[PDB]
Design a protein around this ligand. Structure first.
Ligand code: NAD
Ligand code: NAD
Lengths: 535, 535
C-alpha cells in the first residue's frame, strides 16, 4: 500500500418511525416473533468460540412479561474469565499489526450491517429484553450504535493526522500506539449502543478486550457479538463473558496485564472497581486507564416566558421515555406559577393516560422496569413519597409486578424547592423568584447530568446558561434534557466528574492509545563542544 | 466586543549562542554579577502579597560554590498554605470571568518580556541556582518557557474552536469551562520551564493555583512570579509557597476544593500524593485531575552502520549535558563492537577532558550536582560500580564536595547487556547480535523515557522503530534522546504511564477544563405521542 487514505465521511443515521403501513414495522414484527418464540442459549464468546460455561444458569426474560424467557446464560466462573484474558492477549499481536484501515473496515462494515439487514433484529432484541418501545430501541440499539461506529472511525482517523512541526534538519512524526495489556469493558442494562461501543472503541485503536455485559441486556449483546463476527471481527479481539461479573473482576483486576477499564453504570460499582484497582496498583505493568461514567438525575426550569405546550411535552418525554431508565431522566421540574396555571392540569391528565405495557403492542408509550430490583426501589420511592410531608402524589403511584415489572408514570408535587424510574417531582415557584430558584438549583445540585431551561425570553435563557454554568454537565434550551446524539451533544457527565474523555468525541479514543514522538535528525552534531565555550 | 478573534501564530523562540563578543554574553554577565552579589529574601507570594513566613529559614546557594548564598526562603507553615488556598479561591471569580483573550494576553506578554528585557536575568538566575551552563539555561529557562506560553495560548485557542455539528432545527455549541476548585502545582529543581508552565497552564484556562516550587529552583521561580506580575497576572491567580511542601500538602490534600494536582518529579513523590488523594477521595467536591510525570533513564543503541562521530557526540551530550540531571539522561549505551573500535578511545578521552566547574566561567561544559542529597547518591552509585564484578570504571569516578557538589563525567564498561548524575554505562555487543540486543532492551526496559538508534542503514532503523515500539516513550534516530522542543517532540513518558496529557500539546490544557454541550432547539415538539403509537 502506498497511500494517504481518507475514511468515509460520517453523518448521523436517520431514525425510522415505524409508522403503521411502513415496511420497517412489518420487518420488526417478524423479528419480534422470531426472538420471542425461539429462546436461545446465550453463551460466552471466547477466542471466537461460543460456549456455555459451568456457572449457574440464569434466565433472561421480557421485563414486561417475565414468564416469557428469551434465553439462558451461564454465570462466568473464574476459569471462564481466565480464558477470556488469555484469548485477548493471544489475539493482540495479529490485531495490533493490522493497518488502521483494515481495523476501521470492521466497524464500518458492522455499521452498514446494523443499518440494513440486522437493523430490526438488533432493535427487536433490545425491545424484548430491555423493555423499550420501538422508538427507544431505534434511537439507541440502531442509530446511536451505528453513529458510534462511523463517528469513532472518523475521530480515530482525525487523531492519526494530528502531527507535530518539523524543524530545519529533522523530521518529527507521532505514532499513536495501542495500549500494552487488555481492556476490561463493563456495560449497563439500559443502552445497547453503550454496550456495543465500550468494547469496540478501544478495539478500533488496536487493543483487545474482555466485555462483561449486563444480564438483562445480554440478548442484544450476544446478537451484537454475532454481528461483529459477520463484519470480520477476528477471534479473541473482543471476548464476551456473561453474568454478574463478580468472578470476571476477581481474575481481571488481579492480572498485571490490565491496561484499562471502560465502564458505564452506577457510582457504587464504579467506586468499588476504582478502589480495587487503586488497592492493587503495584501489581500492574502499566498504570490502568480508568474511563467511566456514572449516573445522575436531570432538571428542567421553566421561566414565566416558557411555552406551555413545549414544557409539558419536554416533561412527559424527559421523565417517562423508557420508563425513566436512561442515563438520567427528568426527575425535578421548577415551574413558574403562571405557566403551571396554563399546563399543570394537562400534564397531570396526560401522565394519567400514558400507556405502559407489552412493547410488542406498538400502541404503548413504553414498557416495564428492567428487573425485580428496579421494581422494588421504585415501590419504596413511591411509598416514601406517600409518607413524606413535603410531597403529594398528584397522579400515578400504582404498581403491579404480577405480569411484568410495571410502575405507572408518577408526578409528585413538592412545596419545597435514589432510584431510576418514571417519577417526576414538580415544584411550582412564584414567577418573580426565577433568580432565587436558579440559586437553589445551583446550591443543591451534585448529580445533574443535564439541565434545561424553557423560556422564550433571551435574557432569561442567558441568565440560566450563566448561573447554572457549573450546576449541570450539558445544558439544553427549549427542549428535554435527554437523548444526546453522537457528534452533536458530546460530554455531559455529572458535576465535578472527570468526563471530557467519555464516549462521543476523539478524546475517548486517545484514552486507548499511548502516543509517541519519533524524531529523525539528518545531519547531527559531530563535536560536543558548544559555542559559548569558545575562547 | 463583537469578534471571532485569532491569537498570534506561535513559532519556537530562537536559541542564543552567547558566543564571545556577542551582546547577549555581556548582558548575561551583568545579570550574573547582580544576582550573585546581592542575595535576597525569597518570600511567599500570596494574593499578590510578598511575605516571609514564620517557618524555618533555608538558604538557596550556588551548587557549584555552596558557600555563596543567592537568597533565603522560609518553609511554608500550615497557616501560609491555608492563606494560599483562600487567596486562590478568592481570585477565581474575577479571573474566570475575564474573556479568554485577556487571560491569553497575560501569557503572551510574559513571553515577550522573557524574550526581551528579562531574558538574561531569568537565564542568569537559572544558571546560578540550578548550576546550568548558559546553553542549558537558555534552552530551558528562556526558550522552552517562552514556547510553553505562546504554544499553550495557540493550543487553547484551537481547543475553543472544536465545536459539534448542528442538526436541522437546532444549534449545538461547546463551552470549555474551568474547573471548580483550586489547582496544586508542584515542580522539580531541574527545569525553570517546567516550573513556570505547571502553574500557568491551568491558569490560562481560567483556574487559580497554588504553586510549590523546588527549593533549589526558588530563585528563578520567584523571579518568574515577578515577571508574571509585570505581565499583568492578577493577585491570587497563582500563589507561590516556598519550602519542602510538606505543610502545603497537609492543607491542600485535605481541602475539599482541590480540583487537581499538576506535578513533575520523582515517582516516590508522585505515589505518595497519589495514594493520599485516593485515601481522601470521599472528601473532594470534584474528582481531582491528577496530571503528572515521573522520571526514567534513557538508552542509545548503535548499529554497525552508526556514524562514529555522531554516536560519540550523542553519548557525551546525552549523558553529560546538565550533569545528567534532566528528566532522563543517556544512562545505557549498546554499541556494536566494530563501531566501538572506531570511537571508544575518543569517547573516553573526551569524557576525561570535559570541564565541569563554576558556570560563571562560560568555558565550562557544565556545573555541579544540585545539592548534597544528589551528591551522596552519585558517590554511592560510583562506589557500587567500583565494587560490582559486572562493571569497570573506564574514566571518571572522582568527586569532591568541598567547594561545590562536583562529580566528574563517568563511563562504566559493562560486559552484561537509581540516581541522576553524569554516569554512562556502555555495553559493547558483537555486530551480528543487533536483533538480540534489541530484545534485551525490550525485555529489561520499564523506565526509558526516550531511546535512540544510531544507524545509516534504513533496515536497521525500521527494525529499531518496530521492535522497540513499546520499550520507550519517544524514540530518536541519529541523535541524542534528550531535549524535546515544544510543538516538535510531544509526549515521551515512561512505559505503561498515562502521559498523553503531559505538557506540550492541547491535551494537557483539556485536563484543566470541563467541557459542556449547549443545545438550543428552535421549534420543539408540542405533543408527546410518537409516530409508532398511531392506530
Ligand atoms: N452517565 C451515563 O452516561 C450513564 C449511561 C447509562 C447508565 N448510567 C448509569 O448506570 C446505572 C444504570 O445501569 P446498571 O444498573 O446496569 O448499573 P450497575 O452499576 O448496576 O451495573 C453496571 C454493570 O456492572 C456490572 N457489575 C456490577 N458489579 C460488578 C463487578 N463487581 N464486577 C464486574 N461487573 C460488575 C453489572 O452486571 C452491569 O453489567 C444508573 O445509575 C445510570 O445512571 C449512566
Ligand atoms: N518526566 C519528566 O518530564 C521529568 C521532568 C523533570 C524531572 N523529572 C523527574 O523528577 C526528578 C527530578 O526532580 P526532583 O528531585 O525535584 O523530584 P522530587 O520528587 O524530589 O521533588 C519534586 C517536587 O516535589 C516537592 N515535594 C516532595 N514531596 C512533597 C510533598 N509531600 N508535598 C509537596 N511537595 C513535595 C519537592 O520539594 C519538589 O518541589 C527525577 O526523578 C526526574 O526524572 C521528570
Amino acid at each position: 500500500m502506498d497511500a494517504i487514505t481518507q475514511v468515509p465521511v460520517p453523518a448521523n443515521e436517520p431514525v425510522h418511525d415505524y409508522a403503521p403501513k411502513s415496511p420497517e414495522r412489518t420487518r420488526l414484527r417478524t423479528e419480534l416473533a422470531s426472538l420471542a418464540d425461539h429462546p436461545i442459549d446465550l453463551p460466552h464468546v471466547i477466542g471466537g468460540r461460543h460456549r456455555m460455561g459451568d456457572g449457574e444458569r440464569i434466565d433472561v426474560v421480557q421485563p414486561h412479561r417475565h414468564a416469557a424467557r428469551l434465553g439462558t446464560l451461564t454465570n462466568a466462573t473464574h476459569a471462564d474469565a481466565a480464558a477470556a484474558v488469555e484469548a485477548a492477549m493471544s489475539a493482540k499481536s495479529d490485531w495490533a499489526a493490522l493497518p488502521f484501515d483494515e481495523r476501521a473496515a470492521v466497524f464500518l462494515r458492522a455499521a452498514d450491517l446494523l443499518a440494513g439487514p440486522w437493523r430490526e433484529k438488533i432493535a427487536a432484541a433490545t425491545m424484548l429484553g430491555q423493555s423499550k418501545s420501538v422508538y427507544q430501541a431505534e434511537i439507541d440499539a440502531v442509530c446511536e450504535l451505528i453513529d458510534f461506529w462511523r463517528f469513532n472511525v472518523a475521530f480515530a482517523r482525525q487523531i492519526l493526522e494530528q502531527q507535530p512541526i518539523s524543524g530545519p534538519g529533522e523530521w518529527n512524526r507521532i505514532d499513536y500506539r495501542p495500549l500494552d495489556g487488555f481492556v476490561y469493558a463493563i456495560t449497563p442494562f439500559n443502552f445497547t449502543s453503550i454496550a456495543g461501543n465500550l468494547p469496540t472503541a478501544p478495539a478500533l485503536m488496536g487493543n483487545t478486550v474482555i466485555w462483561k455485559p449486563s444480564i438483562t441486556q445480554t440478548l442484544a449483546a450476544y446478537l451484537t457479538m454475532q454481528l461483529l463476527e459477520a463484519a470480520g471481527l477476528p477471534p479473541g479481539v473482543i471476548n464476551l463473558v456473561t453474568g454478574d461479573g463478580f468472578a470476571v473482576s476477581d481474575v481481571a483486576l488481579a492480572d498485571p496485564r490490565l491496561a484499562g477499564i471502560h465502564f458505564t453504570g452506577s457510582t457504587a460499582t464504579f467506586g468499588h472497581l476504582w478502589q480495587w484497582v487503586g488497592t492493587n496498583i503495584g501489581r500492574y505493568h502499566s498504570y490502568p486507564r480508568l474511563v467511566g461514567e456514572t449516573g445522575g438525575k436531570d432538571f428542567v426550569v421553566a421561566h414565566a416566558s416558557a411555552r406551555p405546550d413545549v414544557l409539558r411535552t419536554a416533561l412527559i418525554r424527559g421523565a417517562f421515555d423508557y420508563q425513566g431508565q436512561k442515563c438520567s431522566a427528568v426527575s425535578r421540574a421548577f415551574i413558574a406559577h403562571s405557566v403551571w396555571q396554563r399546563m399543570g392540569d394537562e400534564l397531570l391528565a396526560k401522565a394519567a393516560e400514558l400507556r405502559y405495557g407489552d412493547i410488542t403492542d406498538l400502541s404503548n408509550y413504553g414498557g416495564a422496569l428492567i428487573d425485580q430490583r428496579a421494581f422494588v426501589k421504585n415501590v419504596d420511592a413511591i411509598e416514601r413519597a406517600k409518607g413524606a410531608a413535603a410531597v403529594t402524589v398528584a397522579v400515578g403511584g400504582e404498581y403491579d409486578d404480577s405480569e411484568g415489572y410495571f410502575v405507572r408514570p408518577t408526578v409528585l408535587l413538592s412545596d419545597d424547592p435514589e432510584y431510576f424510574g418514571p417519577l417526576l417531582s414538580v415544584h411550582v415557584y412564584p414567577d418573580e423568584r426565577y433568580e432565587q430558584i436558579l440559586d437553589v438549583i445551583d446550591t443543591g445540585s451534585r448529580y445533574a447530568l443535564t439541565g434545561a431551561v424553557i423560556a422564550d425570553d433571551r435574557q432569561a435563557v442567558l441568565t440560566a446558561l450563566d448561573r447554572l454554568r457549573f450546576a449541570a454537565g450539558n445544558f439544553y434550551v427549549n427542549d428535554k434534557p435527554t437523548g444526546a446524539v453522537v457528534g452533536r451533544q458530546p460530554f455531559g457527565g455529572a458535576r465535578g466528574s472527570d468526563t471530557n474523555d467519555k464516549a462521543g468525541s476523539p478524546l475517548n479514543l486517545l484514552r486507548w492509545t499511548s502516543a509517541r514522538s519519533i524524531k529523525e535528525t539528518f545531519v547531527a552534531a559531530t563535536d560536543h563542544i558548544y559555542p559559548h565555550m569558545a575562547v
